[PDB]
Amino acid sequence: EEWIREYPPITSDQQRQLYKRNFDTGLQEYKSLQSELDEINKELSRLDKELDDYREESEEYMAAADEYNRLKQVKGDADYKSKKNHCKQLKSKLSHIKKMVGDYDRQKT
Numbered sequence: 001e002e003w004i005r006e007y008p009p010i011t012s013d014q015q016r017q018l019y020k021r022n023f024d025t026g027l028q029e030y031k032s033l034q035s036e037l038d039e040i041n042k043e044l045s046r047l048d049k050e051l052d053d054y055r056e057e058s059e060e061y062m063a064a065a066d067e068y069n070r071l072k073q074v075k076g077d078a079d080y081k082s083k084k085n086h087c088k089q090l091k092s093k094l095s096h097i098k099k100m101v102g103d104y105d106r107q108k109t
Contacts, residue, residue: 003096010104023097026090033087040075044068 010016047068054061074080 019097026094030090
């Protein structure tokens, strides 16, 4: 919900190429953000497996639980959540630019 005023339907090859460059720049940021947000989920996933593995009374289990809770906290704080929101914004914009480019290319084909 919307990007058309910044990136309206294309009317020239040069405007198309400009959109592609902007798309490539945004895609890189999108991917970097995906990886960054994913570092916590992968770690939480491995911690989940460790909780399944260790005896509930062990120090190992307590250590896993503390870390899992630490990460859950980070995942819920402002930095993480805004990064996530930013990632969604970028995804939406990227999807829109890809559509404008595809539409333009389609009518020349």
